[PDB]
Each structure stands twice: as structure tokens, then as C-alpha cells.
Amino acid sequence: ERDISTEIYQAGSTPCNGVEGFNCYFPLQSYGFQPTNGVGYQPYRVVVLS
Amino acid sequence: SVLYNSASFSTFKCYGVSPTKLNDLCFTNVYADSFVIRGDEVRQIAPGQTGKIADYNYKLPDDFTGCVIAWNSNNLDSKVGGNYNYLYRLFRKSNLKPFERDISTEIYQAGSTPCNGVEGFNCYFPLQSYGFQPTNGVGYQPYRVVVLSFELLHAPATVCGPKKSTNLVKNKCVNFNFNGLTGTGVLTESNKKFLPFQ
Amino acid sequence: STIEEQAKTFLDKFNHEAEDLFYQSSLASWNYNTNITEENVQNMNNAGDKWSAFLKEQSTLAQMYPLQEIQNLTVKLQLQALQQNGSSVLSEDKSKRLNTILNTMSTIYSTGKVCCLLLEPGLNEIMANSLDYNERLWAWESWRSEVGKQLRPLYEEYVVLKNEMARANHYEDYGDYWRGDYEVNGVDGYDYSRGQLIEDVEHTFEEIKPLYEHLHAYVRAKLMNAYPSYISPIGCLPAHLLGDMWGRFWTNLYSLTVPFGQKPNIDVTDAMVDQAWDAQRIFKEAEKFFVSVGLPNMTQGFWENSMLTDPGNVQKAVCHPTAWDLGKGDFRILMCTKVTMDDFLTAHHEMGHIQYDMAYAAQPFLLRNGANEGFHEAVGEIMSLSAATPKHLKSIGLLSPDFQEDNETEINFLLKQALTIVGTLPFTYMLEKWRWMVFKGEIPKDQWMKKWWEMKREIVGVVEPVPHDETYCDPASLFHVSNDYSFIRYYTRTLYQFQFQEALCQAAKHEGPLHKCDISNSTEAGQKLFNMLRLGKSEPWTLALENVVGAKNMNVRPLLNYFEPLFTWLKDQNKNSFVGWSTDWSPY
């Protein structure tokens, strides 16, 4: 399944999506691929064949 | 569940454990750490931060799986003329460990000069007083922070719930769950009683 | 064990106790400035005595800590402001004598002897509104033969006492103490010794020389309509025909010199009465002005503890344009705000001082305030000048968007600001240069007043109607000289006013001159200017200047780009035979 829509996560009360109230964080974080990192932090190209 | 919708707390954030799944999750031992700090010191209280407060007063664990409850208090413990009822450690030789405090007095030695148990040259008393006054700013107000700790030991979890209760339905072939026993049938009437302890 | 780990401990110990004492010293003074009574007098003296005693006590103990043993280039710059010594560096017998002279010269300046009447609004309206030659001349001569005579024995001893104070702190003359604020010590690439400050002021004064000759000739040509026999077109101006007693501000002379009579300076006083302002909407419009620039808003306690209205007779007190900084997150403004056009532009001059103090809120008490007090007075002027812009008055609620900008309007606007911003600019360089020869020792006592008039006709261009001897005192009767204040601080304020204005107008899509610029509707100039106000005493003023302007020194080019329509119009009007003034001319 492909998901190309960006939404806002809701936790318990103070509903989100539209009014944007409390407990409405932003789950769409970033990786941070930098050449000055370690080995495991390097970007890997994973190609799944079906 | 009745704490987030009360609209009476300033910063209500959690760590590790989600603020929603805790309503139907058991617990073993739950404690509360009540302490009064300033406004700018609220952001320092977090699992993974440092400073002169999270290292010389109360050290937070790295795997803290609880919540941070903090609200604004102005008409509770504030007076004009400087507050001298709350102290805090400013400097010390070593740092602190999680779930460990320090209430004993110790003269801080900055340089290499003896203090002889009294303050003076390169010798200070690291127990300053706050400035909780109703005429200062917002950051200089007393904040009663109550940190809750969720621990899991070998003892059985006696702090569960709260469980939701529905109603009593009879004369219908529906599903019912009584004391863990799952059944599906018509709850017909009985003509005999059982023992008052089974 | 080392020095760096023990130096910061003494600083944190002093900052945690100074804020508790400085707040009580300012809170006790706030009660005296609200209700005049005998109870607030003793509470202010007792609160101020503990602050003056605790500051001098910790400064002596800090002398044992080394100064040249800091490799962080941050802790060392905080020790120079604490280990400094004042008038107590000499003997104890001569320390009380210097303080007595400062108390006698301030009483004579406040209580005038001209009969009785005082100074303001006593002799202020006589030297401004008179239109007579034999009336305002008597007030200028009587002040020198009465106030100057009583300040003669005190001014002679003021030079010998202030000279030994500067030499005791590793300097040369007393002028180095006032000029030492811009000095950057320590080891750095952009350092700024006292030798560099001697130049860069003498260079910018030569470029403004042709601009001052056209402005001084316009005032001299206007006074000939009322004095056809006392003022010559090829001469100068008397010492009593400048507006003020000392001849500093030429604002009072604007009522006699109007270049265009078609569209003069409009008055927005009647527009504020129609919208019903209860002496509170002026500050509300100033709050939303910095929102479009980029600076954050104020706090919640700022609009609940600061008096921004007139208490009346039930709470008689005092009110003057002076911003207060009580600290500990408390900021109050003491000023009688009424429905007046002059109070609208002055509100922006004090609103910027609150945002400046909030920039270093998280910084300790020693890191408060910038490297020099000249930057604080520059932010308040670059924001108040944009409020008087005719373009900014078209996007607001009051006044008619029916009055646009033209060529006959900008002439009346540039001349009004030229009689205050650049009108007293040559007077600052002349007053500072004359005091350098007194503090050094080039002229004995009997050569002070005879040299003061020689620099007038060569720098400013003011003659003397009555020849005075060496007994009279003319510069000693100044508020900045009798009360001991650095007058050179106003010189850098003029240059930095146009340098900071060009940086904010560059990102706001405004090129060429700076008269039609608009700081609002641009969220880029706010974030760039905030970086300079955040850096206090931890960073030198040279580094903070490059972050806004781009250069490491003062510049005169942006100062001339603002008076382009004025300089173009004065060259076609003063071509009436004379441009400049003669050094050999006298009205008698």
C-alpha cells in the first residue's frame, strides 16, 4: 500500500487534524544523512523485488 | 484520562509510555516527586538533558518511562519581599545518580585553598534561595512540578484499571465476559444459589 | 585547581545576590515616583545604600583573582566591568571633596539666580520665543555673570581631581575614561585601541563640512529679515540667536524657517480624538509595529505593572522620557502619556528599549546591556523616525490617505530633523576637542575661555556679542559637564542612526534615499537586527556592527544619502552671494 498523504497524529484527548490543538505532534521526522556520521547512519538503497 | 481534559496544567508531556495506552495498562509501583522550581528550569527537567539543576538537585534516568506534570501557581506560595523557604544546590564536586538526592551540607571548594568548614575565599555555600515574587516575570514564578515514575519489579502488577462497565443484558444470545470467562449465550434465570465464597 | 573553573563561581555567586538587591533598589524608587511622600524618601535611600556598599565590597575582593589568565575570551570581559574603580581610587581625604563639588554644581544649575526664575521653563521660553534683540541678549549675559561666577572656583578644582583618577587606572587623560567604552581590550583580531578612535571621526567630519555650510547659511539668511543691521550675509551668528542658552539644539528655530508654505508638517493630534483614545491606544499600535518587523512580542506582566497614563492630582509624582529596567523579568515605563502628536513619536523611542532588555534576559547580570550605551539610543530613533514617514501614515487608521508624498513635502520634513540630528553634530566634536586640551595640560587655567571662542568660528561659526574674560564660565554651565556625563556619546548616535536604517531598509525592498522607506511588511529586517541586540558585553561592538551594517568602523556615506533632497535644494537658495562663513567678523 502506498501512502502519499501527510496527516497529523492524535494522542488521546484534544483532537487534531484541522483545529490543531494540544498533544498534536509532528511524526514526519527527518533522517539526517551526513557524511560526518558513522557506518550505520549511512543511507542504504533497499530495493524489494516482488 | 480526567487529567488532560481538565485544562488546569501548563506542560503535560510524557516520555516512553504513550499518554493514551496508560489508561488500560497495569502498573507495579507508582511514585510522585513533588518539587517547586522556576519557569526556565522546567525545560531542563527531561530524560537526556543536563545543566546546574538536573545534575546537582535531581537526576533523571535515561530510560524514564513516565510523565511530567507541571502547572502555574501564583496564589498559592508567593509573597512580596523575597522568598526564603526553598533552597537548591548550585555547585558540588561530583554529580548525582537517578533516584538519589543529597540533603547534607557541604562547602564547595572551587580552587585549591582549604575552607575549614566555613565560606570565604574560594569557599561558598551552594544553597541559594529563589525569588518567587508576584511582581516579577513569568519565568520567576513558582512551578510545583510533580514527576510520576512508572517502575516494573518482580512483584505482580497491582495497579491496573480503570475498567469500563457496560450494563446487564438478558434474554439475548450475545457474548458476555464475566471475570475473564468469555461466553456466548442467553443469561437465563437460575433456581438455585451457590456458596458465598466461590 | 585552575583559574577558569574558580572565576565563574564568583560571578554566579554575585549575580544571584545582585539581582535581589538591584530589584529592591528600583522598586523602592518606583514608590517615590508614584506618590510623593516622606515614607518613600527613607525607603529609597536605605535601598540604594546597600547596593552602593555591596557593589564596592565585592569589587575589592575580586582584585585577588587574576585577569590575564583567561583563555576563553568571555570571562575576562566580565571582570573588567567589576574590578574597575571609580573616585575611590585616590586618597580618602580627597575622595569626599570630589563628591562635594558634584553636589554644588548640580544645585546652582537647577536653581538659577537670574532675577526667582529657574532654567526650564524659566529661561527656555525667553531664548526661544522673544523676537527681540535687547531682550534675549540680557538673559544670555546675566547667566554668565551670575551662574558662571559661582561655578568658577569649582570648575578649576574639577580638572585636577579628575585628571589623577584616570592616570590611576592606567590611562593618560580624563577623556580616555569616557572614550574607553568603545575600547576593546584582550587578544583579538578586531581590537580597537584609543589611537584608532582619534581618527574615523576627524575623517567623517570633513565630508559633512559642505553639508553644514549650506544648512548654516539658510538659518543666517532667514534671520536677516528681522535684523537687517545686526547680521551680515557674509558673517556668522551671535551666541544669543541660536534658540537655546548654550546653542546646542536648533529645534526652536524651525518656527522661523519654513521652506514651503503649501504643504507643511501635518498634525495627527485631531485624528486621534475622533477615534477616542484613552491614552492607551498609542502603545497598542506600537506593539503591532514590531510584529511585522520580526521582533517578538512583550510579556504578560508588562501591560499590568507599567503606568502608561496620567494619574492626575490624586497621585502627584514625576514623569520624564526615561526607560526603566528593574530586572528579574519586570519591565516598567514611567512617562505621562497624553493625546499629543509629540507623544506618539516618543512612544516608539521608549518601546524599543523594552525589547532590547528582553534580548539578554537569559544572560547573567554582568552580561546585561551591550558593549556601549550608544546602541540603545540608536534603536529607539530608527523606529520612531519610520513612524513619522508619510508613507507609513497611509496604511494606518488615522489621518487621510489623501496626502501623498511630493517634492514640497520632503523639504519641510528633512529640515525639521536637520535642526536636531545633524544640527548639534558639529557642536559635539567641538566640545569634545576643547576638553581634550584641558584634561591633558596644553593650556593653563587662564587659557580655557579664550580658546573656547576660537573653536567657534572655525568649527561651528558662532561669534560673541559681548567679549567675556577668563572669569566667566560658558561650557561649565552645561547639564552634561556640571553633572559629569559623556557628551561624546551623542556623536556616535547620529552616525549609527543612518547606518542601521540602511540595513533594515535594504531587505524591505527600498533603494536610494531613506525618507520613503518602510520597516513594516518585512519579516527579514527583524531577525537580522535582533542578533546585535542579543550580544551584550560578551562580544565586542566591532563584531556586532558587521552583523548589521557590514563594516568594522563608522561610515558617513549613509548619513548623506538621507539628506539628498535637502542638499540639492540648499545649493540653489544660498547662492545668494555667500556659502559658508568668515572667521573675522563681529556684530559690534
C376 catalytic? Reply is no
Read off the C-alpha cell for A28: 514526519
Pick from C60, C218, C306, C48: which is nearest to C563 by CA? C218
Closest chain B C-alpha to C366 CA, distance in angstroms: 18
Catalytic residue among C350, C381, C410, C502: C350
* C446: phi then psi, degrees, rounded to nearest 5: -75, 15
Angle, nearest 10°, between helix axes C92-110 and C152-167? 140
Is C320 labeled as ligand-binding? yes
Q: Which run of H or E residues covers position C50?
A: helix C39-61
Beta bridge partners of C184: C192
CB atoms within 10 A of CB B15: 18
String of DSSP letters for chain B: -TTGGG---SEEEESSS-TTGGGG--BSEEEEEEEEE-STTTTT-STT--SSSTTTT-PPPTT--SEEEE-B-SSSS--TT---S-EE----SS---TT----S---EE-SS---TTS-BTTEE---EE----TTS-STTS-EEEEEEEEE--SS---B--PPP------SS-EEEEETTEEEEE-----S----TT-
How far apart are alpha carbons C66 and C80 in whole angstroms?
A: 11
CB B52 within 8 A of CB A45: no
How far apart are alpha carbons C40 and C47 in whole angstroms?
A: 10
Task: Outline where C180-307 has alpha helix (H).
Answer: 194-198, 204-207, 209-223, 269-274, 281-287, 289-293, 302-305
Beta pairing class for B123-124 and C322-323: unpaired
* Neighboring chain B residues of A12 at a CB cutoff of 8 Å: 1, 4, 19-20
Pick from C375, C348, C346: which is nearest to C359 by CA? C375
DSSP letter at B5 equals G
How far apart are alpha carbons B167 and C274 in whole angstroms?
A: 67
CB C573 within 8 A of CB C583: no
Angle, nearest 10°, between helix axes C489-506 and C525-534? 150
Burial-class residue C120 by CB neighbours within 10 Å (0-12, 13-18, 19+): exposed
- HEC string of C286-330? HHCHHHHHCCCCCCCCHHHHCCCCCCCCCCCCCCCCEECCCECCE
Sign of CA dihedral B45, B51, B55, B56: negative
Cβ–Cβ contact B116 with A under 8 A = no
Beta pairing class for C333-334 and B181-185: unpaired
- CA dist list (Å): C570 to A21, C76, C221: 62, 51, 11
Beta bridge partners of B123: B109, B120
- HEC string of C353-382? HHHHHCCCCCCCCCCCCCCCCCCHHHHHHH
CB C486 within 8 A of CB C174: no
- CA dist list (Å): C240 to C133, C197, C224: 9, 33, 15
How far apart are alpha carbons B178 and B170 in whole angstroms?
A: 14
Task: Report the residue from C6, C301, C329 with minimal CB separation from B122.
Answer: C6
- Pick the residue from chain B with its C-alpha nearest to C16: B128
Read off the C-alpha cell for B129: 534561595
CB B95 within 8 A of CB B55: yes
* A42: phi then psi, degrees, rounded to nearest 5: -75, 150
- HEC string of C419-475? CCCCCCHHHHHHHHHHHHHHHHCCCCHHHCHHHHCCCHHHHHCECCCCCCCCCCCCH
Read off the C-alpha cell for C173: 587623560
- CA dist list (Å): C582 to B8, B147, B162, C21, C425: 78, 81, 98, 57, 20
Sheet holding B67-70, edge to edge: B11-14, B67-70, B143-151, B29-37
Is C513 labeled as ligand-binding? no
How far apart are alpha carbons C112 and C123 in whole angstroms?
A: 9
How far apart are alpha carbons C456 and C476 in whole angstroms?
A: 16
Angle, nearest 10°, between helix axes C341-357 and C376-387? 140
Cβ–Cβ contact A27 with B under 8 A = no
Cβ–Cβ contact C134 with B under 8 A = no
How far apart are alpha carbons C411 and C417 in whole angstroms?
A: 10
Pairwise CB contact (< 8 Å): C328 & B131: yes
Pick from C397, C412, C422: which is nearest to C515 by CA? C412
Beta pairing class for B29-37 and B143-151: antiparallel
How far apart are alpha carbons C435 and C432 in whole angstroms?
A: 5
- What is the Cα Rg of chain A in Å? 17
> How many Å from the N-terminal Cα to the C-terminal Cα in chain B?
34
C146 catalytic? Reply is no
Mutation target among B135, B140, B141, B143 for the C interface, most CBs of C within 10 A: B135
How far apart are alpha carbons C108 and C201 in whole angstroms?
A: 34
Burial-class residue A37 by CB neighbours within 10 Å (0-12, 13-18, 19+): exposed
3-class state of residue C190 by DSSP? coil
- Please state whether C559 falls in left (phi above 0), alpha (psi between -120 and 50) or beta: alpha
- CA dist list (Å): C375 to B170, C322, C363: 83, 16, 18
Closest chain A C-alpha to B19 CA, distance in angstroms: 7
Please give the torsion angle defined by the CA atoms of residues B160, B163, B168 and B170, in that order, rounded to the nearest 10 degrees.
-70
- Please state whether B109 falls in left (phi above 0), alpha (psi between -120 and 50) or beta: beta
Query: Residues near B42 by Cβ (< 8 Å), separated by ≥ 6?
Result: B10, B11, B70, B143, B145
- Pick the residue from chain C with its C-alpha nearest to B125: C13
How far apart are alpha carbons C26 and B63 in whole angstroms?
A: 46
Task: Report the residue from B111, B124, B139 with minimal CB separation from C1.
Answer: B111
Cβ–Cβ contact B99 with A under 8 A = no
Read off the C-alpha cell for B136: 516579577
Cβ–Cβ contact C57 with B under 8 A = no
CB C438 within 8 A of CB C479: no
Read off the C-alpha cell for C447: 587659557
Task: Outline where B74-142 has alpha helix (H).
Answer: none
Pick from C136, C59, C16, C86: which is nearest to C465 by CA? C136
CB C359 within 8 A of CB C349: no
* Neighboring chain B residues of C1 at a CB cutoff of 8 Å: 111-112
Pick from C506, C508, C490, C499: which is nearest to C552 by CA? C499
Is C144 labeled as ligand-binding? yes
Cβ–Cβ contact A23 with B under 8 A = yes
CB atoms within 10 A of CB C570: 23
- CA dist list (Å): C300 to C3, C14, C325, C332, C460: 41, 28, 16, 12, 49
Pairwise CB contact (< 8 Å): A14 & B20: no
Amino acid at B15: Y
Cβ–Cβ contact C309 with B under 8 A = no
Pairwise CB contact (< 8 Å): C301 & B133: no
Cβ–Cβ contact A13 with B under 8 A = yes
Angle, nearest 10°, between helix axes C152-167 and C425-440? 80
Beta pairing class for B174-178 and B181-185: antiparallel
How far apart are alpha carbons C462 and C587 in whole angstroms?
A: 11
CB B125 within 8 A of CB B107: yes
Is C349 labeled as ligand-binding? yes
Chains B and C touch (3+ CB pairs under 8 A): yes
Give the CB-side neighbour count of residue C331, counting CA atoms within 13 A: 20
Residue that the C-alpha cell 566591532 belongs to: C542
- Cis bond upstream, residue B61 (ω within 30): no
* Neighboring chain B residues of A14 at a CB cutoff of 8 Å: 4-5
Beta bridge partners of B195: none
Cβ–Cβ contact B8 with A under 8 A = no
3-class state of residue C547 by DSSP? coil
Is C353 labeled as ligand-binding? yes
Pairwise CB contact (< 8 Å): B140 & C328: yes
CB C522 within 8 A of CB C507: yes
Domain extent listing, chain C: 1-588
The C-alpha angle C23, B123, B81, rounded to 5 degrees, equals 20
CB C495 within 8 A of CB C377: no
CB atoms within 10 A of CB C197: 15
Beta bridge partners of B124: B108
DSSP letter at B88 equals E
Is C248 labeled as ligand-binding? yes
Chains that touch B (3 or more CB pairs under 8 A): A, C
- Pick the residue from chain B with its C-alpha nearest to A23: B13
Pick from C422, C383, C402: which is nearest to C566 by CA? C422
Per-position b or e across C283-322, b if 16+ CB within 10 A of its CB: bebbeebbeebbbeebbebbeeebbbeeeeeeeebeeeee
CB atoms within 10 A of CB C231: 21
Pick from C579, C557, C562: which is nearest to C210 by CA? C579
CB B44 within 8 A of CB B51: yes
CB C50 within 8 A of CB C21: yes
Angle, nearest 10°, between helix axes C4-32 and C39-61? 170
Q: Which run of H or E residues covers position C176?
A: helix C175-179
Read off the C-alpha cell for B75: 496564589
Pick from C308, C377, C374, C317: which is nearest to C347 by CA? C308
Is C465 labeled as ligand-binding? no
CB atoms within 10 A of CB C498: 25
CB C371 within 8 A of CB C343: no
DSSP letter at C231 equals -
Sign of CA dihedral C240, C245, C249, C254: negative
The C-alpha angle C519, C520, C521, rounded to 5 degrees, equals 125
String of DSSP letters for A2-48: ----------SSS--SSS--SS-----------TTS-STTS------
DSSP letter at B121 equals T
Query: Residues near B195 by Cβ (< 8 Å), separated by ≥ 6?
Result: none
Query: Residues near B60 by Cβ (< 8 Å), separated by ≥ 6?
Result: B45, B46, B47, B48, B49, B54, B98
- Pick the residue from chain B with its C-alpha nearest to C362: B40
Cβ–Cβ contact B179 with A under 8 A = no
- As a residue count, chain C comes to 588
How far apart are alpha carbons C270 and C283 in whole angstroms?
A: 18
Read off the C-alpha cell for C410: 520632503
Angle, nearest 10°, between helix axes C489-506 and C376-387? 50
Query: Residues near B162 by Cβ (< 8 Å), separated by ≥ 6?
Result: B23
Query: Residues near B165 by Cβ (< 8 Å), separated by ≥ 6?
Result: none
Pairwise CB contact (< 8 Å): C329 & B139: yes
**Looking at chain B, after which residues does the C atom sit over 2.5 Å from the next written N, breaking the chain?**
none
Is C194 labeled as ligand-binding? no
3-class state of residue C396 by DSSP? coil
How far apart are alpha carbons C450 and C455 in whole angstroms?
A: 10
Query: Residues near C126 by Cβ (< 8 Å), separated by ≥ 6?
Result: C135, C136, C139
Please give the torsion angle defined by the CA atoms of residues C524, C530, C531 and C534, in that order, rounded to the nearest 10 degrees.
-170
* Neighboring chain B residues of C9 at a CB cutoff of 8 Å: 91, 108, 110, 122, 124
Read off the C-alpha cell for B197: 465464597
CB atoms within 10 A of CB C110: 13
Sign of CA dihedral C460, C465, C469, C473: negative
How far apart are alpha carbons C495 and C510 in whole angstroms?
A: 20
3-class state of residue C523 by DSSP? coil
Residue that the C-alpha cell 523639504 belongs to: C411
* Neighboring chain A residues of B4 at a CB cutoff of 8 Å: 12-14, 22-23
Number of helices (H) and strands (E) in chain C: give both, helices first: 26, 2
Amino acid at C115: C
CB A8 within 8 A of CB A24: yes
CB C166 within 8 A of CB C265: no
The C-alpha angle C136, C141, C145, rounded to 5 degrees, equals 150
* Neighboring chain B residues of A13 at a CB cutoff of 8 Å: 1, 4-5
Read off the C-alpha cell for C350: 521608549
Closest chain B C-alpha to C10 CA, distance in angstroms: 8
Amino acid at C11: L
Read off the C-alpha cell for C123: 529661561
How far apart are alpha carbons C417 and C497 in whole angstroms?
A: 12
Query: Residues near B196 by Cβ (< 8 Å), separated by ≥ 6?
Result: none
Closest chain A C-alpha to B18 CA, distance in angstroms: 8
Cβ–Cβ contact C225 with B under 8 A = no
* C349: phi then psi, degrees, rounded to nearest 5: -70, -30
* Neighboring chain C residues of B135 at a CB cutoff of 8 Å: 27, 301, 305, 330
Burial-class residue B164 by CB neighbours within 10 Å (0-12, 13-18, 19+): exposed
Pick from C280, C379, C382: which is nearest to C333 by CA? C280
Pick from C202, C207, C216, C237: which is nearest to C433 by CA? C202
Pick from C282, C303, C399: which is nearest to C348 by CA? C282
